[PDB]
Homo-oligomer: 227 residues x 6
Amino acid sequence: TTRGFVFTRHSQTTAIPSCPEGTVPLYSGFSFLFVQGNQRAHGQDLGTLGSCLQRFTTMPFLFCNVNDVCNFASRNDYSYWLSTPALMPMNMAPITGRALEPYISRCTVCEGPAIAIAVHSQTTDIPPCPHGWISLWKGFSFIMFTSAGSEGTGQALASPGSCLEEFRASPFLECHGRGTCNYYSNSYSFWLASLNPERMFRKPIPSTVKAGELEKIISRCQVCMKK
Amino acid sequence: TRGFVFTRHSQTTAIPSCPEGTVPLYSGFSFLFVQGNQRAHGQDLGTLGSCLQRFTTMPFLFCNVNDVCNFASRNDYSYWLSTPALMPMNMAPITGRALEPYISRCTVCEGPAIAIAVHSQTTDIPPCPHGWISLWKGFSFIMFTSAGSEGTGQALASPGSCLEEFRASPFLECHGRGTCNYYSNSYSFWLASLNPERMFRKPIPSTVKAGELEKIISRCQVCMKK
Amino acid sequence: RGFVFTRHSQTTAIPSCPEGTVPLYSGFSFLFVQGNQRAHGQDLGTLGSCLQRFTTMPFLFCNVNDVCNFASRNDYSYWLSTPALMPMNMAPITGRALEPYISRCTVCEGPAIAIAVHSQTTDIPPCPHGWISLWKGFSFIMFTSAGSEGTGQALASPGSCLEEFRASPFLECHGRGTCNYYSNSYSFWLASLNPERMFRKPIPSTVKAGELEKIISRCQVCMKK
Amino acid sequence: RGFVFTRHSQTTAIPSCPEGTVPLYSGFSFLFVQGNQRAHGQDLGTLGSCLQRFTTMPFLFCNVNDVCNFASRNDYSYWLSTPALMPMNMAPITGRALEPYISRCTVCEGPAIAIAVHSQTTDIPPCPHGWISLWKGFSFIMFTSAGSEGTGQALASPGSCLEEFRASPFLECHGRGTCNYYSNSYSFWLASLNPERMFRKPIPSTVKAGELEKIISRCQVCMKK
Amino acid sequence: RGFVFTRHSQTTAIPSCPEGTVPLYSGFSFLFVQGNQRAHGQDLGTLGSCLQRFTTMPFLFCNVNDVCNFASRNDYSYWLSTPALMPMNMAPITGRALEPYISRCTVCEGPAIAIAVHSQTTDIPPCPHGWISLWKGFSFIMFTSAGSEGTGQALASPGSCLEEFRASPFLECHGRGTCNYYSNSYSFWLASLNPERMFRKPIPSTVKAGELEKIISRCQVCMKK
Amino acid sequence: TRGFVFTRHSQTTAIPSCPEGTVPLYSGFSFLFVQGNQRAHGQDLGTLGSCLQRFTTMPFLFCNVNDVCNFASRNDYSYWLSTPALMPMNMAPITGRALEPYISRCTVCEGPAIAIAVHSQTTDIPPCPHGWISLWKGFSFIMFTSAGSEGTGQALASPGSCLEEFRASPFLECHGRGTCNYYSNSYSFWLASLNPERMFRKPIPSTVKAGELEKIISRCQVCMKK
Ligand SMILES: [Cl-]
Ligand SMILES: [Cl-]
Ligand SMILES: [Cl-]
Ligand SMILES: [Cl-]
Ligand SMILES: [Cl-]
Ligand SMILES: [Cl-]
Ligand SMILES: [Cl-]
Ligand SMILES: [Cl-]
Ligand SMILES: [Cl-]
Ligand SMILES: [Cl-]
Ligand SMILES: [Cl-]
Ligand SMILES: [Cl-]
């Protein structure tokens, strides 16, 4: 029998992901990272049911004022979703309508018998689950993100959401009330850094790496469940 | 009972009741967020943190590196969920005792299992997952902004993202100088009700007024495992 | 049973897990980071606030050109500090001289959920019936530093209940390797209130060293028995 | 002699240059833009506040990959408005229906520099000795809209002295082509003060339609003769 | 001829207009305001930086419901200060007790444009060929206070050249009527550089009371002769 | 001359020439804006303030209420107009002296009358008004953002809003730690070229790449009164 501890897994592809062994699916949906309303970012924990919306839309929210008037998609607000590996058109222009379907990551909301946590190494090595815990999946340490106006937020390192299984320099898409989505130059992803186990307490060594050797410098992580 | 604490908010002057199967720990006033040095920080409305037993327009102070602290001695803010009580004709701020009819009430409860929230994104109430029990039905409350457009939101997994009465203006702005008021830039953000067939379609801009607002709001339930 | 929380020493000493709980690992007290001038914090009552490796730059960023940078711009990190004071030149510190300054933490596992309770008065609040006291502390709500960026703690969380009150509970650290206290470094605490005066206009108060804990709300971290 | 300034009608009528000055051109009243959520304004008393062609998106941005985007993200523009009121439905407007809403301006050239003088009282301030009055108005100091971004006018500039007081002197316009008034659109004005009451605590005051101009500071725009 | 500028005493004394210029009025040194958490400043070398009447709340705001509020929310105003020290209790001040802390200013009229010149060294820069010196000072570039909001001065403007260097050149004032210095109140100045190696890594430097002026860039305000 | 000072920017390592009729006062390096304590403050590119004689990555310092000043001892920024010099393939920041080939140069000039800017909002060059003389042609440069998306802009009335050489990346980000680089979030804002035949209709979204950029940029002239 289950116990009431709900968490989420994200495919980061168009494929609906599988719940790890021992856990049961509740429902599936699309990977919902954060919104920007009136230029204020608010995010969802990627390891909770909040990060998995049944319905996709570029505008999942509305706002209301003190005159008792509400507006939906009637101003310049934002929403952000985890993306697939799918490429953007050569023209570099935004996309609208059903052409977005290949771009949005999918998620499964799962229920387990115990709490699921995440563990981080800060090194290239996979961290071990604590004693008495079971491994659910391997991943990379995903800490925070900024996009337009450099607004954004992050994930709790204790949460399964801080451990993405596919590393991507661009893990998310910027979407608008007017119906468009795109990657933009100021879209940033922040990750915990892989560090030298010998070099503690010294000036960090500035480092700039390019495609092909990026995972070389990313902290690793595991999501674990109590037995 | 097993240690899973959550909160219910009346959104009226009435102290709310804990749902069947849960036990009250204490009661207090509905505490949404603060603004210190122009930085918003909020509390999860489904956790004990959103229920303070002692109301005040200034529940906090700040301290510097010269070991000097100040209470209510600068322009900082606090925010509380409000009642349906309307504001005086003059549109001026209120101070002192006259605030009592405006502050929402809360009860901190204890249950045998975790309480989560489920959202539909449609006008229909979502079902609790298999093996879960309904605690209350409500509306999907996601974020909020006020002065300097600062603010934060609720976790959609949390009971706090599911308010039982919908209000265009669910909160009051309060100041260290002792005053509170609704302001033009006070905004509430809610998950939108969507048409089931039109997924991956350009959203249709919509502007609705009093009397037909609840109509475009996403619905939710708070559920506890059995 | 699976309920993980963290304790913070606020000294160079590695803290002890409370009665009935087992240590998972120890590390350094990690409060928050500032990337591209956006603050993001960790809950001080969860394993996230306790990193095994200390560094002034625990993170990196990557762009849409598939290029990543580590400590190659002006980003920040923040850690809870010890009572160690700063060199009188008032200049920043680098390298291994930082060790006496960084607070320490132990990640613990318990049989049940640990919550925090707050009084809003100088009196210690009682644990709800059926709950056990883990430690008593002060109500820590939020914090700002550079650009007045920052975040806070959940009052429900063990993290909102620091055992040692300090006007300056954290250090500002930089990618270039330096750390220091700065004038705009602020700590926010729940205020101690007079019980017989609710719904009355707050009385502005300014207190100095020796007098500070007099106006701080008190708290307890409790676990279900 | 080369001293250029601007006058704003705040109506659909193209304004007249004051006596002794010559028109250079006319256009639409351009207040400020918001790109990537950063406000930048134009001085309302300089030719920059008068754009020949109106559009809801007068600008574009370019990145380091040598790619530029026009009206392809969520950016803003702001224009001084007319007294024309908005539709029943409270929805935004697009297209040609915007005409009746955008204020007109004329760029003028004078023989001397034009300045503004402010009273901080209900009384019109006198031009300094040897200066000539160009127009009367109200002391307009700053403004905020979405994200509470915005900027203001220099009080030394003609731009800080609007001839027609309006609670809502400007319209918020978008790259998607729409414009509207919004609840968080604010206008800031220098306040009319009691002459006896200096270094006294300010008296909080809230006024409604019909009594608003009682509390606004007055101003004159003057040119050297 | 119509070229208006301002001089600031930075004391309780009403300053004198420089040789060849005429006083038009005097007042109090007005730096910037914060409405709805947005800073907007005045150029310290223009008449806007010199307000006839002092108050902690020189402005009001109005919404789209045609409702205006004066001193009825948490807004700010900022003024240049005197060398007057603050009471030992470190608490804010209200009322007429503020009189000894607000700097004074004189608005002057000259025959030609007044500009500022900066050295980036400890040496006083020379006026360009055909220009006359009005005063000597220090290079004042920007400032931040609450929420780290603020703005600065144009280096071309007389306002970027303060005659008296002060680590704390301004006071923070509130709608509720109080003013004080705060820990996060910051002044930014152009730095004095040693002429030999340009394009070389800046040397981090931290100095305290008694030598501060050794590292500040110098400036002169000049008028065309 | 009569006392009207303005600046010209080469946008190259070459010290620019004052336009005919004007006299040089001095020269220096093209200084755009700074970021202290995460607040941007800029200089007008058409005034002497945009031209500093001594380049440095940290032209400023800050002081607190304890009478303590710090120079280059925190994370602050400075921004300068750049040259067409490209960056090393490693994409890493530069320090010290590999820096000179990157900083734009400027000349501060004195004229007999006021120098203004005129903008077309079309691909055509705008004519100087009646009785005014052309100093140079250029492109309409309105604002800029970089780190934290902080930034400011130029006055369209000012010579500074009219850059002679269009660049997607007109400026470099420099730091107190001594480094400089282009970054992804470095943005330049320009007035757009518009279809004359349309006014008051939807803007047509447009995305344009290298080779076709100046096609959509508004044009400008800097003029002086005769
Ligand atoms: Cl929208
Ligand atoms: Cl882009
Ligand atoms: Cl306060
Ligand atoms: Cl209001
Ligand atoms: Cl960094
Ligand atoms: Cl400092
Ligand atoms: Cl746009
Ligand atoms: Cl609205
Ligand atoms: Cl106020
Ligand atoms: Cl302070
Ligand atoms: Cl620095
Ligand atoms: Cl970058």
